[PDB]
Amino acid sequence: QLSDFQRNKILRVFNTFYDCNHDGVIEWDDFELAIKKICNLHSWPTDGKKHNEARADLKLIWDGLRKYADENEDEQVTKEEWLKMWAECVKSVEKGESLPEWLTKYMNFMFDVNDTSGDNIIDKHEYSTVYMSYGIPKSDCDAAFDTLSDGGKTMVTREIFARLWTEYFVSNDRGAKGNHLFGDLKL
Ligand SMILES: [Ca+2]
Ligand SMILES: [Ca+2]
Ligand SMILES: [Ca+2]
């Protein structure tokens, strides 16, 4: 199963990015929250393309996560179910098979949220603008971004971001740069 390192990486994300209302479970309510949070960030109209567009993708993502981790079918993902899922989902990515569809779907969703200007590149400002809005300190965005972009040597494109996403969730390597996808970890 998952090491202390992996567990904590998987939990850190649960508590930070998924459990918006901060009550200890994931539900549709946390997603209506995200949508609000990102609209406030980018000043999208409550009813524009981006708002409804985003509401569609999250309905998909949620529907994906929950037909996947919600063993007990009550429309709620517990940390217990989250971890139980990730356990087998991880040992299955290190046996050859790729991620679940909903998880790629969230990754593209996140990428598009970052890539404000829409040139297919996350620049340092766009990055810190997002991740500061989830509580990650400005300095942990700068330390992170220098790692993910490789002091400027690598362009953070949709493709590169997806590969860092997988490293984050699955790698048991402390040296792996995808570890700092969501803000700098002291390792
Ligand atoms: Ca919640
Ligand atoms: Ca449940
Ligand atoms: Ca950009």
Automatic annotation (TrEMBL):
<feature type="binding site">
    <location>
        <position position="119"/>
    </location>
    <ligand>
        <name>Ca(2+) 3</name>
    </ligand>
</feature>
<feature type="binding site">
    <location>
        <position position="21"/>
    </location>
    <ligand>
        <name>Ca(2+) 1</name>
    </ligand>
</feature>
<dbReference type="InterPro" id="IPR011992">
    <property type="entry name" value="EF-hand-dom_pair"/>
</dbReference>
<feature type="binding site">
    <location>
        <position position="25"/>
    </location>
    <ligand>
        <name>Ca(2+) 1</name>
    </ligand>
</feature>
<feature type="binding site">
    <location>
        <position position="74"/>
    </location>
    <ligand>
        <name>Ca(2+) 2</name>
    </ligand>
</feature>
<dbReference type="InterPro" id="IPR018247">
    <property type="entry name" value="EF_Hand_1_Ca_BS"/>
</dbReference>
<feature type="binding site">
    <location>
        <position position="76"/>
    </location>
    <ligand>
        <name>Ca(2+) 2</name>
    </ligand>
</feature>
<feature type="binding site">
    <location>
        <position position="121"/>
    </location>
    <ligand>
        <name>Ca(2+) 3</name>
    </ligand>
</feature>
<feature type="binding site">
    <location>
        <position position="117"/>
    </location>
    <ligand>
        <name>Ca(2+) 3</name>
    </ligand>
</feature>
<keyword id="KW-0479">Metal-binding</keyword>
<feature type="binding site">
    <location>
        <position position="126"/>
    </location>
    <ligand>
        <name>Ca(2+) 3</name>
    </ligand>
</feature>
<feature type="binding site">
    <location>
        <position position="123"/>
    </location>
    <ligand>
        <name>Ca(2+) 3</name>
    </ligand>
</feature>
<feature type="binding site">
    <location>
        <position position="81"/>
    </location>
    <ligand>
        <name>Ca(2+) 2</name>
    </ligand>
</feature>
<feature type="binding site">
    <location>
        <position position="30"/>
    </location>
    <ligand>
        <name>Ca(2+) 1</name>
    </ligand>
</feature>
<feature type="binding site">
    <location>
        <position position="23"/>
    </location>
    <ligand>
        <name>Ca(2+) 1</name>
    </ligand>
</feature>
<feature type="binding site">
    <location>
        <position position="72"/>
    </location>
    <ligand>
        <name>Ca(2+) 2</name>
    </ligand>
</feature>
<feature type="binding site">
    <location>
        <position position="70"/>
    </location>
    <ligand>
        <name>Ca(2+) 2</name>
    </ligand>
</feature>
<protein>
    <submittedName>
        <fullName>Calexcitin</fullName>
    </submittedName>
</protein>
<dbReference type="GO" id="GO:0046872">
    <property type="term" value="F:metal ion binding"/>
</dbReference>
<keyword id="KW-0106">Calcium</keyword>
<feature type="binding site">
    <location>
        <position position="115"/>
    </location>
    <ligand>
        <name>Ca(2+) 3</name>
    </ligand>
</feature>
<feature type="binding site">
    <location>
        <position position="19"/>
    </location>
    <ligand>
        <name>Ca(2+) 1</name>
    </ligand>
</feature>
